[PDB]
Amino acid sequence: RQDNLLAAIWQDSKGFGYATLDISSGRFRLSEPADRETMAAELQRTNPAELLYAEDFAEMSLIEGRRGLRRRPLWEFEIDTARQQLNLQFGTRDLVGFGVENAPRGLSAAGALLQYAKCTQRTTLPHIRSITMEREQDSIIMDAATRRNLEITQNLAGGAENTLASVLDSTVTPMGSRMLKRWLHMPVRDTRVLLERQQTIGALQDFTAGLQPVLRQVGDLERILARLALRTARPRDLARMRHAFQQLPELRAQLETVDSAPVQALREKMGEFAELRDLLERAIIDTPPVLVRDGGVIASGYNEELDEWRALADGATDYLERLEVRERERTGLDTLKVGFNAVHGYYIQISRGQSHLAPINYMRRQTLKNAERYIIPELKEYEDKVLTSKGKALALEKQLYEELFDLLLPHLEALQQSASALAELDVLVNLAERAYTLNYTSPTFIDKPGIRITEGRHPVVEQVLNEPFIANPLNLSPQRRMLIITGPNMGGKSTYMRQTALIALMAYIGSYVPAQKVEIGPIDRIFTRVGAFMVEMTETANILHNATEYSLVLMDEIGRGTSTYDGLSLAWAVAENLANKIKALTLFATHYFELTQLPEKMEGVANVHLDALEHGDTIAFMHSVQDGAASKSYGLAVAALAGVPKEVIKRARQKLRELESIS
Amino acid sequence: RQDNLLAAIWQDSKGFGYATLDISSGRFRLSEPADRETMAAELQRTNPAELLYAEDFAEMSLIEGRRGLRRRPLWEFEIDTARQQLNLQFGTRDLVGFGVENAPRGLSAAGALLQYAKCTQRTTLPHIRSITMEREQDSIIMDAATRRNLEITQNLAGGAENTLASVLDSTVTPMGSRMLKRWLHMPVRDTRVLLERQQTIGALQDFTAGLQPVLRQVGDLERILARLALRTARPRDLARMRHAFQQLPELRAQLETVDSAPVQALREKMGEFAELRDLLERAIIDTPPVLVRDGGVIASGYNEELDEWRALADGATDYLERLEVRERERTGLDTLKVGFNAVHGYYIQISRGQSHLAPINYMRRQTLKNAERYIIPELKEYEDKVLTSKGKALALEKQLYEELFDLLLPHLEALQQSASALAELDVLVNLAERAYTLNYTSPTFIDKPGIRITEGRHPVVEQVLNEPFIANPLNLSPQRRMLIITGPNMGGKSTYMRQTALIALMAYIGSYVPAQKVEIGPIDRIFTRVGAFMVEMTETANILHNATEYSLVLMDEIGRGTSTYDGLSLAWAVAENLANKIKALTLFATHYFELTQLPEKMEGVANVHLDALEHGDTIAFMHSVQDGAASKSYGLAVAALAGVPKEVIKRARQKLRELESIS
Amino acid sequence: VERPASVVKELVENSLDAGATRIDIDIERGGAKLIRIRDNGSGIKKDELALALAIASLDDLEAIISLGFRGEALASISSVSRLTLTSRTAEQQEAWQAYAVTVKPAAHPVGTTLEVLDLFYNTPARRKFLRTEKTEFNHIDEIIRRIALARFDVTINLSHNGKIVRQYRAVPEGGQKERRLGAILGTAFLEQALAIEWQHGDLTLRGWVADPNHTTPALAEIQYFYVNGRMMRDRLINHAIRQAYEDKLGADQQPAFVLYLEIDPHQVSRLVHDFIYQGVLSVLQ
Amino acid sequence: VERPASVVKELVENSLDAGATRIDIDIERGGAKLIRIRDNGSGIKKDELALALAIASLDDLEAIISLGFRGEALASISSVSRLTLTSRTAEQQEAWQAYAVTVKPAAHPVGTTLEVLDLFYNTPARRKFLRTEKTEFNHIDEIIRRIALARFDVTINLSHNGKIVRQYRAVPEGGQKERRLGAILGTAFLEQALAIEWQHGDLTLRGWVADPNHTTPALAEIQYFYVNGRMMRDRLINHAIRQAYEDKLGADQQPAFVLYLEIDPHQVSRLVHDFIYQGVLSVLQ
Ligand SMILES: Nc1ncnc2c1ncn2[C@@H]1O[C@H](COP(=O)(O)OP(=O)(O)NP(=O)(O)O)[C@@H](O)[C@H]1O
Ligand SMILES: Nc1ncnc2c1ncn2[C@@H]1O[C@H](COP(=O)(O)OP(=O)(O)NP(=O)(O)O)[C@@H](O)[C@H]1O
């Protein structure tokens, strides 16, 4: 009933930083309002009883009226002094364990808050043991590990293929390929947005054929419009742009029939611009050169004066030829050529041996090694008019090209809109094709955290594998919330886990999913931890501190302690916390066989395993998920088959025989 | 004692591939002769009794005379069919365990060999269980893991800093910075090359000051010479090149006094090229433009005709001005400007309001918005000569620039030599400064594999740490060849290992090393295994199959089996093999405490550990290497300090107490 | 066992005889390098693989080659190839595989898979004869196109050099024949398609004929006629359709059609001709 | 305890009195942000740290402040800072650290380290007085420069904002004074340096004086005179050198010198002047 809270605030040239604290409870928080308006909203939201601010704070309009205003020195809002004091209080060397390491504007505010707090209280403050971020966009949250590990766009070591992007990037235009990639790094939780895209995908599944080919011809319109604004655009950029407008009437016709409110919306957004289309059909040649510099861009029939000066220049090609033939056959000197040199001008070249036979009507203009070049009156007067006419035509061609920018820029706003609309279609047309071709099903959403899969598949792995992928079901709810997985390596453990995370991501971007049936609840954050120790302990805590009832947590083979069982001791406590306190949707893979005791100890946890079969002369991984814990050790079998020398393996199995004679 | 062997050979457009096999012994090999000559050398070396070749083999001169010539079909030398049949024989799905995965030209040859062999023998061939590469470059070998893990040039995640390169890149010119980086990826085993560089480093340690500043002014000469050969070179490339030649006489003077045979060698190799220097001082302006295309590159006084046509054009600026002043003050119209337009030509502009006051003389050439532009007889005749003179001067400026290439290309060989010499100086001058400033010592070499370090330091880690790095000694020999290391995480295990590998690398490029004293034997290959399982077992075998007595092997925390001790079972057998058969210089880090039994079981193996200290219950890592195995598990202590909530930690230690009440 | 196209066809119909509804064909480089057919039809037991490829195992087990004429066809391929095959029967069986005289177990769903490295492995000649890569793929694709139209009810997936080319989705009873028809024949045919359904008792004619008024010779590539599963060619049928085309419009430009006839056992009768001509010409007007 | 330069000097000489031969000084942003002095001299025991900054030390854990007047100086810094200190003595000790009343252990070699976050932490005024980052660094560097020349035998490392600025290598007995002299004074001074060695019994003059004929006022920044380790200023000395400079060349342009005078503990005296003048003028000619 009573917020009686404390807060701190600060500004740099980027935005505004915020932190809140209560001493009656110990709750310690951080956030970063991006703009002036959101910062205002967050103040009254929290309604603190006291408010610390730096003497430098410029936007006094936000805080002047607030109760408990307290001016403080600047050096207190020092980031490193802040970082330093905070690490002491929690008893750590890093704030990675809290997942607020990259929030410096807020941390500067929390730094002065703690320094103030130290001095104000001097009462029991061990109940201030933590700090979490108040994440403004509780849509979906992903850390660096999740962004690289799922392989959305960056494969493990930086390459491009074997990603989720590499599967679904069957988009025709580059602006659509880029747009697709943005959608995967940003799924959102609004049901409206999701149902729009699903419904669109379904109504377009039939029209896939006619649509894709047309969109490719558009080209990279998004980036051509940039050069237009900059006034850098080249002849060939406007040609693809021209051809892109020739597609619009046809796309209008194709999308007309598609019965769907979302589709008809994007149909309008597309645009028409028949005015711009006509201009360019008359203004530019069908296939123009790379640069404007050398001419041959602006068409005949477009401008009066352009064609006039070109007619003078175009009276060149045929005259040079007649001059060459006239003079060659009058004299009877076959090595007579008509050519040009930038420095000297036009000339009549004769070889060295025939140079003595020239009528010397011919004046010597230029002497070579094995040829003498000459000039006569008829060529020299003609020289002046041809080159200078080209120049006036070429100079005018550059005048008129600068003019073409002035004409097109007026529709620039609407072209940006046409570019975003066409790119979105390419994405949704593409996803409809993948859903049909790859045999995907639409997912459904529920009110509480929970997942129900029927014969779910791994969308990346299933494609590379030119053999059967063993699909597997899944059933999670707030009551059945943790699954402990034991068994062989390459057994399909991490696979069975990772397929579920991708399925969830795909659901929350609005696409169809690789399974028979998919039911799923809300998911606020996705967290990820992958094996190897400086590394491990540090980041296990990030997930524990932040995760919620609605979150998804994905543990891969933790517990590489400094001994045998000190590492097991950790994993047990870890699991009990996630299952008992946080009650999140958890999937716990581990090789430590002893953790399979939990279900009898802990309600709401259950055992599963990747069963594998040892027979004949070899091992066959069934990749088939079964209830109950794994049977045994499979590691020695694994080692051999990957490609270990047989000599070594004998010594290993011998040693294993020794270990199992202890008990 | 004579060779009675079998072999196979093949060629593509890249080079020639080779493989050898014996059925009396089972020895199976592969290599890839890079050039036609080395291929010849390798044939007589092996002197096979029979030789398979593809019907397509073009270089018959190598093999015509050889005994046992056998023509075979092409499809047999298919790479994938080859790969397929080979995986069957060894019983695997990959040849990564043998480290010949990226030798396809040889594997195509071994493919037809095995298919021939299968059919020819049909006798016991389980004794053919392996294949290793005959590595032409037995200088030093490094795989992908070693190249990224040491952080030579690429830090873990692709960034540039915290690398060995980042320490030593205090080089002044880019061609030297690039050269440094080549040297790190390619150390060689010739003692002469090593002693050259060490001696050079010592004699230059005093002259560091005067030398570095001069080398910077050279600029990136290496890549400017490329554009010279291509004929792309721009005006400003030749300007920095000109300035680079102005450095040569100075460098000659500085290096004269430096008494060292290697230094005086590089002093000569530098060159002089006073001829080229003079040309460019006269030929190009002090500060030329980015491109040749718009002129202002070639100097006045360089060419007769250039200055002549420029004199006609330079008669423009003063005439345009007199015309403007004459006409402005004759009329009394102050808004009279003289300007130019590409399309219409020169003009005399008067504002709209004053246009009615212009004299009858002025013909209207162009009408604007708020101004009328005019032309008179005096400007129009003058217009022709000025623009066309510029053009002939500009056209000639391009003639002469193309000329400058023809004149310089003759010494291109010698310039390549000068460029390589200057780049090598920058490298050696740089390493002398680092060796002095960072307090490094020169290493000494021995005949047998063995390493003896005195207070060795980690050269990268010591610098970013603004506190003490704990230096540690090391002693390895053919008799003391393995060290088993247990203890805490972040204890300094991987560190104590990794510092040793870098030390070896630095020794085998010819540089000084971070320690008191360094003695070291020959080292042929460096191998690297870092934790995390498809991954782990696959590559543990690569190292086992290839490694030798002279090699350095670096094992980090292996044995993540599918259970508790199946993973330990592996590590035991692994260790016994490296120490007992291969007898390599090995460093084995492992968390499994039970492996510390080996020294008493195994001759030539010894226990060490990173001791750490617990008071109350918070921890100081001494990072100090001591004889004997570690004391205990330290993992729970590790977890807490990285940043785990204390609440969880209590539950963990409780559970640890439960595990140790089992016995 | 002459072209690669023929080896594809027989193994496709082997799976069809086993009640297969999903036949996934993966092929690489004309079929030389790779031919992989995976079928979901009735599988094969562990004892039954051994002998189909071992050849002296039926000297008195005697009874099991009885199971198929497909089983008779496998042997002719496998002795003269690097054949690999995996199969799992009924349910709760393990999968089993064989190499070419050696067998062992594996892991598979209930069905069959058949992998082949360029058939001829001991014949130097008969492989060195084998024609192009691209052109053989076109023959294979034609063969599958012909099986495809006959059996609208079986899903067939054709991929070349890894990447998929044809995904022929099956048509359910009470379903869309256009989805499949356009995928096979391209958009082109689908545009001018006029359906035909004629019946006088036992004679039943189903199919499609293109509108001659807008038909070009680019549509006319398509001329298929099937009878109770398979296409035979006889000159009788050839005239029936062209008479109808030439009499509809005097301009006799090439006709486009795909038609299926269904009847009682007689290999051929005169009525056969007249029945067809009547059906076609009516639809046009 | 007024400028940051002064806090540096005292903690430097604290380490000197403990027999330190390597003093590494790391400073950041004028010294405000960071001041770290790490010394390899004699360290400090666990009970001896506690009370130097927790005054019932010399009663309850007693007669131990006796150990240093450095221990008297630490207290004046630590109460008014975010001080941090770690030290390890003699042998097989652990390292120990404190904040200023809270202490605990750590890991270090036999020596001492002293870390400071911007001295004044409770004083709003005396910090708001502290003025520039760059300019304060210049005062510190001057202070260290003066300690450097007095003690040629101690290696001193000065780094600013992470990156190192000065690395003063010590001079061994029977060694090169030039390595260090050029590093301190730049190559500039080293070029025109003429050594001076005068002695009349107890009076001993050692050092260097620049050749006036090529000396510019850019060399003249350097004017230091020490007496038995420390520089005092008295006007007597000022004249002795300038008389010799003005009499050598009538153009009285600014002199460049670094000189050390060495005597018995008795402050007195007229001979002091004449001794010096004689020594300088002779070297010049
Ligand atoms: N000799 C040393 N002196 C000072 N600091 C060190 C030293 N060695 C390592 N460190 C620090 O300790 C960290 C990691 O040590 P490391 O050698 O990787 O531990 P480990 O015992 O190999 N086991 P793990 O780190 O868990 O794989 C680094 O981040 C360093 O900052
Ligand atoms: N359901 C499945 N069907 C077919 N192949 C699979 C399946 N699951 C996994 N694989 C294959 O198994 C390989 C590696 O297995 P993986 O799941 O990484 O093992 P793991 O048990 O997680 N151990 P680790 O990789 O060390 O964490 C992959 O590259 C796949 O090619």
Numbering used by the authors:
A (entry chain B), B (entry chain A): 128 to 659, 670 to 800
C (entry chain D), D (entry chain C): 20 to 73, 80 to 125, 132 to 299, 315 to 331
Publication passage describing the model:
MMR is initiated when a MutS homolog binds to a mismatch. Once recruited by the MutS sliding clamp, the MutL homologs activate downstream repair.
We crystallized the MutSΔC800/MutLLN40 complex in the presence of DNA containing a G:T mismatch and the non-hydrolyzable ATP analog AMP-PNP (adenylyl-imidodiphosphate). Our crosslinked protein crystallizes as MutSΔC800 dimers bound to MutLLN40 monomers, and does not show the MutLLN40 dimer arrangement through crystal contacts. Accordingly the MutL monomers have the apo-conformation of residues 80–103 and no density for a nucleotide is visible. Although the complex was crystallized in the presence of DNA containing a mismatch, the DNA is not visible in the structure.
